[PDB]
Write a protein that binds this ligand. Structure first.
Ligand SMILES: *[C@@H]1O[C@H](CO)[C@@H](O)[C@H](O)[C@H]1NC(C)=O
Lengths: 49, 48
């Protein structure tokens, strides 16, 4: 995710997990959505289940 | 007397003069400033 001039951009790519959690082979990342947020993103948090 | 209710009515009937008819007024306010565009016009497309 990034917040250049607003316009929040999200890029995602799901790879069937291999033996290594965060391995090393290359994996491209594709955009999913880009919509004009326009707020001062400074803090970040996650949700659980 | 000397004690007036703040609001009065727009009593409307099918028979007045033009200046007293129930005109329907809708005003559109735009924000044409430097900000990310959200509402745009009907851009026209054509053949190939
Ligand atoms: C926060 O984002 C808005 C979006 O335009 C901007 O006006 C404002 O300058 C930003 N805050 C700061 C400190 O730059």
């Amino acid at each position: 995710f990034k917040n250049i001039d607003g316009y929040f951009k999200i890029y995602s790519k799901h790879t069937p997990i291999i033996g290594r959690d965060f391995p090393q082979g290359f994996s491209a990342l594709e955009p999913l959505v880009d919509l004009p947020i326009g707020i001062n993103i400074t803090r970040f948090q996650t949700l659980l289940a | 007397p000397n004690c007036y209710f703040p609001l009065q009515s727009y009593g409307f009937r099918p028979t007045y003069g033009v200046g007293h008819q129930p005109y329907r007024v809708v005003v559109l306010s735009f924000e044409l400033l430097h900000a990310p565009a959200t509402v745009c016009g009907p851009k026209k497309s054509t053949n190939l």
